[PDB]
């Protein structure tokens with residue numbers, strides 16, 4: 001089951017030592033439906049963060065892929081910053097977080 005890596009770095013906000021989570025969801029249209037095909041969460045206290053999904057090429061073949069990246073604070077169930085972009089396998093994909101207007105004090 002040969003695999004290729006969809007990976008890169010997440011940056012673009014300063015966490016300043018605050019405990020955070022990054023939730024990365026990889027989307028693809030699978031027979032015409034937009035679906036999450038993979039998800040990772042990372043616990044971090046600074047950026048940038050290097051990420052990687054190792055996915056079967058059989059699963060990736062022919063697919064547009066989209067990466068949804070969401071920063072939250074640990075202890076607060078709310079998105080503080082996020083990114084949405086098309087990505088491609090085997091490419092170092094730079095994810096640049098965009099702060100919400102309510103950052104860093106967004107609420108659940």
Ligand code: NI
Pocket residue numbers: 010011012013047048
């Ligand atoms: Ni950075």
